[PDB]
Design a protein around this ligand. Sequence first.
Ligand SMILES: OC[C@H]1O[C@@](CO)(O[C@H]2O[C@H](CO)[C@@H](O)[C@H](O)[C@H]2O)[C@@H](O)[C@@H]1O
Ligand code: MPV
Ligand code: MPV
Lengths: 141, 143
Amino acid sequence: SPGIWQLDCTHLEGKVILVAVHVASGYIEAEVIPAETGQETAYFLLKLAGRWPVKTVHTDNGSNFTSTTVKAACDWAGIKQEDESMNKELKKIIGQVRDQAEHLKTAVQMAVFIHNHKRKGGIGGYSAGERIVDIIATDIQ
Amino acid sequence: SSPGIWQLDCTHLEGKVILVAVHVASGYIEAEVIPAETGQETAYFLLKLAGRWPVKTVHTDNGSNFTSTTVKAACDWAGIKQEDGIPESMNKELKKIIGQVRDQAEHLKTAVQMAVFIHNHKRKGGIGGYSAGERIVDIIATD
Ligand SMILES: OC[C@H]1O[C@@](CO)(O[C@H]2O[C@H](CO)[C@@H](O)[C@H](O)[C@H]2O)[C@@H](O)[C@@H]1O
Ligand SMILES: Cn1nc(-c2cccs2)cc1N
Ligand SMILES: Cn1nc(-c2cccs2)cc1N
């Protein structure tokens, strides 16, 4: 399960936030896009797969994933498509920083920073970002 | 190199701008096509990068986009030590790979992400070697 991601959309202030969660770590990647289109979905997936070893993405089965451009990007990147706890939290963190920035895009990326750096537990814990890299590094044997 | 050092560099193609972040110790890259080398685009790029990887230090070319106060303010918010004017064939290599995949993409930005994918997955130094993607994770894993 080092290659398993879950992708969802959240609609806010009339734009769309594409959120990808690495299911094993809780690590998040997100973008704000003007609209939930095939072109934007494909691009997002391609960016993700170039940065992390993406095997399988679980989606909501919306029309943006049925696109010939998404199928092509998935074939090219070797991504297989199939088919909240962390997504609900991301919405909460976006509210807590919302006032610190003019644009929603900024607030979103500040929330991704906060989420991925935040140590869970006491001294001896890990962040989501530590967890993804430890998991992947461990798998490289 | 030290694990938290990234080098930012820009490259220009088909009259658009490619912002490139190289993780110095591994050669791992992240890139985005942006409309223009503005303060807000640069800030936003850095904020994204710093949310995705441990970014302690950034070396820049000291372009005007890095002297803007929205960039300096992002780097402060994110705890990034901005090091302007601290020192090339990474742009050469990216452009070459972009040339190989260019005809498989309707739009430049897609060919850029395809080229980033290829660079990061390419095994460097023979069959027992490792890709940039493998090197970065191995270098920064703490446990
Ligand atoms: O809000 C989008 C934001 O991303 C940038 C680069 O940091 O451009 C890319 O962003 C999206 C990636 O999913 C795409 O919508 C866009 O096509 C792409 O170039 C910024 O320029 C932009 O503000
Ligand atoms: C301390 N540390 N932080 C990380 C992150 C990875 C991705 C986001 S943050 C990885 C390690 N080793
Ligand atoms: C083949 N492969 N590629 C990786 C990457 C790690 C980070 C980016 S890509 C990890 C493994 N096992």
